[PDB]
Amino acid sequence: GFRKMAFPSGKVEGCMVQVTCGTTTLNGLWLDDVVYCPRHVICTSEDMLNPNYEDLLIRKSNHNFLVQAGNVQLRVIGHSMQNCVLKLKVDTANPKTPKYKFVRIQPGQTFSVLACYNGSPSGVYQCAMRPNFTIKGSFLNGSCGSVGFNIDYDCVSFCYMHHMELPTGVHAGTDLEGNFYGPFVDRQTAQAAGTDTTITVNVLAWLYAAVINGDRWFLNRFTTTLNDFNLVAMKYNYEPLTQDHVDILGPLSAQTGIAVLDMCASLKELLQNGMNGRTILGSALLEDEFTPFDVVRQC
Amino acid sequence: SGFRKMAFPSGKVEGCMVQVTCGTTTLNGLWLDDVVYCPRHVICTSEDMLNPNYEDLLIRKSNHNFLVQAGNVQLRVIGHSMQNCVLKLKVDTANPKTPKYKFVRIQPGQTFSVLACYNGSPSGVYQCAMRPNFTIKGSFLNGSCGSVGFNIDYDCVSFCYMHHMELPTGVHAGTDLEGNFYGPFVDRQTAQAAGTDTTITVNVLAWLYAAVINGDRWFLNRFTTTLNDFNLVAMKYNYEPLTQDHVDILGPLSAQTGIAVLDMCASLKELLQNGMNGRTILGSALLEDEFTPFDVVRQCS
Ligand SMILES: CN(C)c1ccnc(N)c1
């Protein structure tokens, strides 16, 4: 029984609001007395192309921003910009504010996204930050400002805010301090994500999950070196494995008795020869959106 | 584009999850108004699980034998009754977080979200379909009994499933909120096995139509088929047979794309014959069967 799960979204649902600047409406995150959203909400048709946000923001007054939490309107009483995030100070602290922190994640790490439209939560999904710094998300228009998060022991770690849809059906965004993930800019310009790769450490975690779940047909008697594994992996668009990644997998090795470079030889064989009509955890394809931590928690 | 499967936001259900304990057994309960619903096997001892006589066991129990906890607050049980396989515990406090709700029974192929819980605490949420063999491929979380499945429509929560047990095949079985099991299963630890599972063909076709709407058209062919010829081939791949109701349900997607249903069926037949050839459809390397026509149509105008 191994299904991918998102975190329960209730604590985040209590924070979603609707932000409108002129004709543009998108989602905001209401924490204490501040609403956070993408700074491009201030952009206009002319602005779109090569905007100067800061010139545009200081020339915008608080009444330009319409914030709605359900049917109750929040009055913006101050506004400031931090990198690509707009911070709107409101006259009311959110009584539903959970315990939270803003964290920055790394490519390969997983989190849940609460997809919203016009400030209303629509759905939740679990994903990983791709190695090319994009997120395979949904194509729910009007979702800019939807956030990504993890929950650790009652505390919500917000790690991502959605800013734009790339042409290839992938999304790009920032952390909650407005720093972009990846080499992207918040402007309507020709932008494309680099070629994506498979998150090797997560595939290995998933193979560890399969062994713990008694799906062991792919285990072999061989081991490989990290250099030999990396040469093969990069030819198949698998991310290179670092010593840090090997260390992260340490506890799964101790739990299963399969050394990391032993499991690497299994994965190496799987790349070069495939599954030959067999499945792992019931899937014919290798999963790379489960981290080693996700496996230890679930298993 | 990339259609990512999504679960409904679980907040409205999280506010209803409680912990129900009987003797040494703790599991989840659903607190709606002044009633807590949970699997009746919370009342069985280790000696009774092969052949529990629930009526015999329930009559011997009293309100004070049940420990119901909502967070750190103990709710008082003031009544109990059994409805098929669900136990209903009347409590002295109505849940103030009770959302608008309905109990509905679903059919195989229909989708819903599950809020997986442990000890009354929500742990994770996933989206799934009820398989043609009446099981759910759920998570392996321990003591998740009593976790519920639901859909949300315009702020109304429709509860359709409650988890009761894990079958030897790793799959899960449960009931609707009236305590009727989905499929030929019983709340007994006796030898029970799920029949061979099949693919939900109507959902695959809806997903292929979604791909066409998003400009993924590599798999289309110029052939059509009869419904009978399609069903004969599909069953050879353990795909469910398509009925005229399924053809009608796909009608609007056929009209939006200009591809007759039986034309799309011929393309699916080709995919079954050929395999993906390492290609992807809507960003997935596999044929997705847990997206219903209802969900496709709403999301694509
Ligand atoms: C880099 N920028 C714009 C910063 C850094 C730290 N704090 C604030 N508020 C803005």
CB A44, CB B163: distance < 8 Å: no
Among protein residues, the one whose CA lies closest to atom 9 of ligand 1 = A82
Return the half-sphere exposure (C-beta side, CA atoms, 13 A cut-off) of residue B59.
Answer: 4
Burial class (CB in 10 A: 0-12, 13-18, 19+), B207: buried
Residue B41 known to be catalytic: yes
Looking only at the bridges linking them, the beta strands covering A155-166 and A147-152 are antiparallel
CB B170, CB B131: distance < 8 Å: no
The C-alpha atoms of residue B287 and residue B276 are separated, in whole angstroms, by 9
CB B91, CB B36: distance < 8 Å: yes
Which amino acid, A249? L
- Chain A residue numbers touching B139 (CB-CB < 8 A): 1-3, 5, 298
Selected catalytic residue, list A21, A37, A40, A84: A40
User: How was it solved?
Assistant: X-ray
Say whether B126 and A9 touch across the interface (CB within 8 A): no
Rg (CA), chain A: 22
Q: Which candidate, A250, A6, A285, places its Cα nearest to that of A128?
A: A6
Q: Which token pair is A161?
A: 């805010």
CB A172, CB A164: distance < 8 Å: yes
Is A82 near ligand 1, meaning CB less than 6 Å away? yes
Question: Across the strands, what pairs with B175?
Answer: B162, B181
Q: Which token pair is B144?
A: 């998740």
The C-alpha atoms of residue A103 and residue A149 are separated, in whole angstroms, by 9
The C-alpha atoms of residue A45 and residue A125 are separated, in whole angstroms, by 32
CA angle B256, B257, B261 (to 5 degrees): 100
Rounded to 5 degrees, what are φ and ψ at B88?
A: -115, 120
User: What is the phi-psi region of residue A49: left when phi exceeds 0, alpha when psi lies from -120 to 50, beta otherwise?
Assistant: beta
Provide DSSP, chain A: -----BPP-HHHHTTEEEEEETTEEEEEEEETTEEEEEGGGG--TTTTSS--HHHHHHTS-GGGEEEEETTEEEPEEEEEEETTEEEEEESS--TT--SEEE----TT-EEEEEEEETTEEEEEEEEE--TTS-B-----TT-TT-EEEEEETTEEEEEEEEEEEETTTEEEEE-TTSPBSSS--SSSS---PPPP-B-HHHHHHHHHHHHHTT--TT--S----HHHHHHHHHHTTBPPP-HHHHHHHHHHHHHHS--HHHHHHHHHHHHHH--TT--BTTBSS---S--HHHHHHH-
Say whether A139 and B5 touch across the interface (CB within 8 A): no
Selected catalytic residue, list B16, B41, B80, B246: B41
Q: Which candidate, B126, B124, B166, places its Cα nearest to that of B145?
A: B166
Say whether B9 and A125 touch across the interface (CB within 8 A): no
Q: Which candidate, A168, A132, A109, A162, places its Cα nearest to that of A290?
A: A109
Q: Tell me the residue range of the domain where A290 lies.
A: 200-298
Residue B145 known to be catalytic: yes
Say whether B4 and A284 touch across the interface (CB within 8 A): no
CB A42, CB A60: distance < 8 Å: yes
Contacts 24+ apart (CB under 8 A), B88-94: B88/B35, B88/B36, B88/B37, B89/B20, B89/B29, B89/B35, B89/B36, B89/B37, B89/B38, B90/B34, B90/B35, B91/B31, B91/B34, B91/B35, B91/B36, B92/B34, B93/B34, B94/B33, B94/B34
- Chain A residue numbers touching B286 (CB-CB < 8 A): 283-285
- Look up the CATH number of the domain holding residue B60: 2.40.10.10
Tell the residue number behind the tokens 């859909």, with chain if given.
B151
Among protein residues, the one whose CA lies closest to atom 7 of ligand 1 = A82
- Chain A residues interacting with chain B (CB cutoff of 8 angstroms): 1-11, 13-14, 114-115, 121-125, 127, 136-140, 169-170, 213, 282-285, 298-299
Burial class (CB in 10 A: 0-12, 13-18, 19+), A37: buried
Q: Which candidate, B214, B231, B301, B216, places its Cα nearest to that of B266?
A: B231
Q: How many contacts does A have with B, using Cβ atoms within 8 A?
A: 102
Q: Which token pair is A164?
A: 């734009």
Contacts 24+ apart (CB under 8 A), A245-248: A245/A200, A245/A201, A245/A204, A248/A201, A248/A292
Among protein residues, the one whose CA lies closest to atom 1 of ligand 1 = A83
Q: For chain A, what's the residue count? A: 299
Best of A5, A130, A143 to substitute, by most chain B Cβ atoms within 10 angstroms, is A5
Among protein residues, the one whose CA lies closest to atom 5 of ligand 1 = A82
| Three-state secondary structure of chain B | CCCCCCECCCHHHHCCEEEEEECCEEEEEEEECCEEEEEHHHHCCCCCCCCCCHHHHHHCCCHHHEEEEECCEEECEEEEEEECCEEEEEECCCCCCCCEEEECCCCCCCEEEEEEEECCEEEEEEEEECCCCCCECCCCCCCCCCCEEEEEECCEEEEEEEEEEECCCCCEEEECCCCCECCCCCCCCCCCCCCCCCECHHHHHHHHHHHHHCCCCCCCCCCCCCHHHHHHHHHHCCECCCCHHHHHHHHHHHHHHCCCHHHHHHHHHHHHHHCCCCCCECCECCCCCCCCHHHHHHHCC
The C-alpha atoms of residue B212 and residue B207 are separated, in whole angstroms, by 9
Tell the residue number behind the tokens 């499929």, with chain if given.
B183
Is A83 near ligand 1, meaning CB less than 6 Å away? yes
Residue in A with minimal Cα distance to B4: A138
- Look up the CATH number of the domain holding residue A289: 1.10.1840.10
CA angle A61, A63, A69 (to 5 degrees): 130
CB B141, CB A299: distance < 8 Å: no
- Chain A residue numbers touching B128 (CB-CB < 8 A): 3
Q: Which token pair is B275?
A: 């395999």
A13 CA → ligand 1 middle, Å: 27
CB A147, CB A160: distance < 8 Å: yes
Resolution of this PDB entry, in A? 2.1
Selected catalytic residue, list A43, A84, A127, A144: A144
From residue B251, alpha-carbon distances to A269, B245, B247, B260, B295 in Å are 46, 10, 7, 8, 14
The C-alpha atoms of residue B110 and residue B198 are separated, in whole angstroms, by 14
B121 CA → ligand 1 middle, Å: 38
Among protein residues, the one whose CA lies closest to atom 10 of ligand 1 = A82
Return the half-sphere exposure (C-beta side, CA atoms, 13 A cut-off) of residue B122.
Answer: 27
A82 CA → ligand 1 middle, Å: 5
- Chain B residue numbers touching A169 (CB-CB < 8 A): 1-2, 214, 283
